[PDB]
Amino acid sequence: LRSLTTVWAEHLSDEVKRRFYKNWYKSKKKAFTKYSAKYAQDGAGIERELARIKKYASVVRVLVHTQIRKTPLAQKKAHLAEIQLNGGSISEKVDWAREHFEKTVAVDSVFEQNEMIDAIAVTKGHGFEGVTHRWGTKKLPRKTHRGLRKVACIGAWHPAHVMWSVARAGQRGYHSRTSINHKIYRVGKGDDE
Amino acid sequence: MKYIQTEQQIEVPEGVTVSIKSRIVKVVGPRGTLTKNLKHIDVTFTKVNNQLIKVAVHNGGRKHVAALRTVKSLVDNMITGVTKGYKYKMRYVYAHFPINVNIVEKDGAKFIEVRNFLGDKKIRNVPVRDGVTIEFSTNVKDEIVLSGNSVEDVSQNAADLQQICRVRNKDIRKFLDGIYVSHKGFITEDL
Amino acid sequence: TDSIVKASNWRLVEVGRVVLIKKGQSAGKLAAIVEIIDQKKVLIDGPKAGVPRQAINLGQVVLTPLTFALPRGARTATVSKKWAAAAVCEKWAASSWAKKIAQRERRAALTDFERFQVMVLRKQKRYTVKKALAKA
Amino acid sequence: MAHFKEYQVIGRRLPTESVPEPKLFRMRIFASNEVIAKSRYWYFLQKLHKVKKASGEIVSINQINEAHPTKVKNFGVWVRYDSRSGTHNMYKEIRDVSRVAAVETLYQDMAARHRARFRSIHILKVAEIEKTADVKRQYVKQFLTKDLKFPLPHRVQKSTKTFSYKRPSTFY
Amino acid sequence: VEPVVVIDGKGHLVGRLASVVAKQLLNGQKIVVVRAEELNISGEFFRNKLKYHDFLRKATAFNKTRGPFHFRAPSRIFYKALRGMVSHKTARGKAALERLKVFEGIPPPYDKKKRVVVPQALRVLRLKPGRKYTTLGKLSTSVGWKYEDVVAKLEAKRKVSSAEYYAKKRAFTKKVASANATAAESDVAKQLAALGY
RNA sequence: GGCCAGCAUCAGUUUUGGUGGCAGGAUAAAUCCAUAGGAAUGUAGCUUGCCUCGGUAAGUAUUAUAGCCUGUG
RNA sequence: AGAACUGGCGAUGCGGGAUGAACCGAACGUAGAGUUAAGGUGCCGGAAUACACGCUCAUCAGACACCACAAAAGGUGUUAG
RNA sequence: GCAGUCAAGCGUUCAUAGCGACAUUGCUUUUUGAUUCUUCGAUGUCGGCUCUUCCUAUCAUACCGAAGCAGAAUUCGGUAA
RNA sequence: UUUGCUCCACACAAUAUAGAUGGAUACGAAUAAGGCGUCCUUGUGGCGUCGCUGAACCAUAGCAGGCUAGCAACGGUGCACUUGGCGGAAAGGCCUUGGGUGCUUGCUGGCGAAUUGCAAUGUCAUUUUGCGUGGGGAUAAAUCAUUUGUAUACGACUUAGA
């Protein structure tokens, strides 16, 4: 699969403009300023792109970003991401996408009560880990010289190489995971006591 | 020893016109039409006259010659299938549990649904193949009846049913239960 | 609704099948299959083109679509008699094949100048045909 | 062993005082040259008589040329041969145009069907099967049927350039 | 002979195609191979499938990375066949391989360029008829290649456009032939016939 | 005449073509010609049986409205 | 493990047998041209994807001395007897 | 140590369901021997613990074929690590 | 930080080069079957023809191709422009329109060529970069340090700061 165009909305919240930077405060904040001018003239440029997507394109994804300022976090810099679109017909898809530029989508139009959903996230971090807790290896006996949270035999004499399949110390956590089958017990509304 | 020429005949009946390009055989008779690919073989078909076709193998080994005859038959049975038609008969066999056989359908389907086999709570299902049609033969106890233009499609659809009723974990010569092919024949009668 | 069964229609090894020889001191020469030895060997004879009566591998020979009356195992004089009689030589001479053989044989014998003359001619022929190919 | 000639080889028992003019025996011998052919002669003669080359003499060596070298003939061939596990007598029929041709492909056939190298074979008789319907082996009877005609399906022309611009055709 | 020779893979035998493609390179001849999914291998599918799984088990025991890599795409099955025929660890070796390119289907440029064939590797000229043989696409997809169906799609599309092209071409050459026929009988025409033209 | 080359005529070594004259042999064997006999995977003619006015088939039939084999010269 | 005769390796490179003390070829001053040996000529790799007759299709085919193994016993696979 | 071939026997009857004498062909290299080629200017000896990976001549588990398989239970054999 | 960047144009200069030296010249499919022409009932159709290799086809004459004149044709083609249309598999190329302009060896003329000395690749390609000039166009950011802790052995990660 290969991306051939990305059509962007005319206006762009600072929260996303945040994301395109590493030093927002110092910066002149020129991100997407020429692009925005593509709207000016009648529409020409963006139509042809939208049009091109429509003609080819085997899948359509939407670029959504989060409203991190509506959130207790301090982070300020929002989160941008692509979401595939599975309603009918390539063309209706981009029409939907175009219709929703700068506009907003709600959770209750994607999820409903009792739905099984999956969670995709980066696992909590633990930094550099011993072999015992990282792999659940057996603790060595108390009598052993030079320590015991280890593995006793790191391999046979042949292959005369430590192999990929034995437990070694090293990073623990901050792994990407894809959990499935988490049932939704509530879809909460914010404007609701 | 490489036989320099051996050949066979395919007779053609009053109502049908077989027609063959590359090695693709289309046989069309009163009962419909059947087509079958022979490209995997190397024989040479030859029309001599609207009631006769010859098939032959130039300079061939045993296996090659051996496949001459089976070509003859495969096109023969297309021709007979398309005239008389085929009709496989099967009877149920069970020493205590009545085997109940119906025809269900999901999404245009047509499936053969076998119930209570040896008691099994499990519901058995066999697809009805396209071209083959299934009557539960009245005036005969526990007779199912598959018929079609294509031997190979009725023979197989039957064998599909008989085999979905294999008996496991028992002495299968005491537990003889199952649907079995009980007669192989033609559709159009007197013949 | 007839039946329509292709054909596939091969040249045969059979007595009095004329063949163009392709390897050897004969080569380019025609000849006639007289008798027939095994699946792979035949006895040929080509008195008119000067090829010796001989045994030959079919693979050295190429079968032409020409045939003519020949008693199997016919001797050389008999071959030359029927050959003439059947006029095979003008028959072959007349074929696209032999015409194509004669062609390239000529092209190969041209002279640097003849070659140059050909070019001047083609330029000329091109000029009038390109015109034609532009009016309808 | 090669491409054969056929020789008459004549020899005889070195003369003596009490027995001058010894009996004279002939063999036809299929061989590539007259050197191999005299060798072969002595090889068989010491299998039949009390002689050996040391005490015998070759009298004449002559090449026998085929009578009618462009007449298709049906040969029946008798052979003796050594297999791996014991020795064996055979009859084949070979159809070609000279006895010399015929022996060339016998030797080939023994080698290929029975893995018999040239040392392990003895030609017993090679003789033209006069009247047909004495032809025994079917791989020959086959070729004797009246008005015989057969096509050669699936033609392979040998390319001369490495590349082609056509896609070939095995028509014929 | 030509600056670049594009070979239509279809109906060619892997190792014979490899054997000639290798030698061409080493001699300085750029080559592109196309439709590699329609390559053939002697022997029935099941054999060449098992043969593949033998290749498939060889790996560096201590680290399956460093060990032998298994490419599953028909082009790349083919490249393996080739690279083995080329002293590919010499500079001269790397040199010759850079003259090579293999593709599934016939992507741009090459699809409007003519492709040739290689008779001494053409299956239909080489395999004794009756012997079983294998199609790369079928083999590759059985060992994990992802893209058989797409290649099929795109080609069928390509294959439509080019029949247009052809038919349009076939129609113009008919004009040309008509044009040629009036010129027949003219002096220049009879003259050229003399000189073999 | 310093360095390197090209061609010509020759010499030593070698390699790769064209071409002339002779000697053997079954004084090659064949083809070819002549002649005697012969047969069948039997050419004409003939007979017989079906068969849309002859074409087939199964009999006779040894050069006839094809030819071949075998010896001798 | 131990004798007989010769030829070797040890003391010896060179060409071949991928590799290798002993096998095959061949024994060494510096070089030019030629021809070969043993062994090879699809590609790696110099050299016929040469010619010819068979044979063989293996859901663990086979592929060249020394050499880097297989046997009894079986097959209605196929081939010739 | 493990596996065959022949088939006299065993198995109510019945050679080969399951077994199998007298013979006889093999495989294996966790047995033990035989050897003494490598290491004596030194390659850390038994067992356990820990841990990885491999083999299959498969104990269990998936799907099968056979039985002197009524059922249940078992036994034999296949694809299987 | 000394007038920097970019696209186009030519100019000088360097530096290269796995190897220009008329043209990579486009259906598909089958091979115990096909291409092409033609007709028709439009089909697994009739009739004709072809292969047997690209040995083809196309191009090809002119100071490495100069300077010139005329005729016949109204064709071919180069080039920059302009009309409409197609191609996303890596489309980055293909087709169509229209005027302009150059060439034309389709044919017929005037002039030139030597002394590069009897051969010496006798230099005619395309890669990348550097430096001025002036025809368009454009006016950022990252890092250190500071900072958070969804991160961390150090780097790295993740926040924040006109």
Ligand SMILES: COC(=O)C[C@](O)(CCCC(C)(C)O)C(=O)O[C@@H]1C(OC)=C[C@]23CCCN2CCc2cc4c(cc2[C@H]13)OCO4
């Ligand atoms: C009988 O035992 C020994 O001889 C033990 C030892 O002394 C090993 C101790 C070595 C040091 C001092 C380095 O620990 C020794 O000399 O080992 C040799 C030794 O020592 C390094 C190496 C040897 C010989 C080759 C490998 N092998 C392994 C160790 C060993 C073990 C033995 C053995 C000999 C060896 C030798 O006989 C019985 O079991």
Ligand SMILES: [Mg+2]
């Ligand atoms: Mg784009």
Ligand SMILES: [Mg+2]
């Ligand atoms: Mg801890």
Ligand SMILES: [Mg+2]
């Ligand atoms: Mg644990």
Ligand SMILES: [Mg+2]
């Ligand atoms: Mg845990």
Ligand SMILES: [Mg+2]
């Ligand atoms: Mg542990």
Ligand SMILES: [Mg+2]
């Ligand atoms: Mg301690």
Ligand SMILES: [Mg+2]
């Ligand atoms: Mg059971």
Ligand SMILES: [Mg+2]
């Ligand atoms: Mg039970």
Ligand SMILES: [Mg+2]
């Ligand atoms: Mg004779």
Ligand SMILES: [Mg+2]
């Ligand atoms: Mg010099």
Ligand SMILES: [Mg+2]
């Ligand atoms: Mg000289």
Ligand SMILES: [Mg+2]
């Ligand atoms: Mg001479």
Ligand SMILES: [Mg+2]
């Ligand atoms: Mg005749």
Ligand SMILES: [Mg+2]
């Ligand atoms: Mg010493």
Ligand SMILES: [Mg+2]
């Ligand atoms: Mg030596």
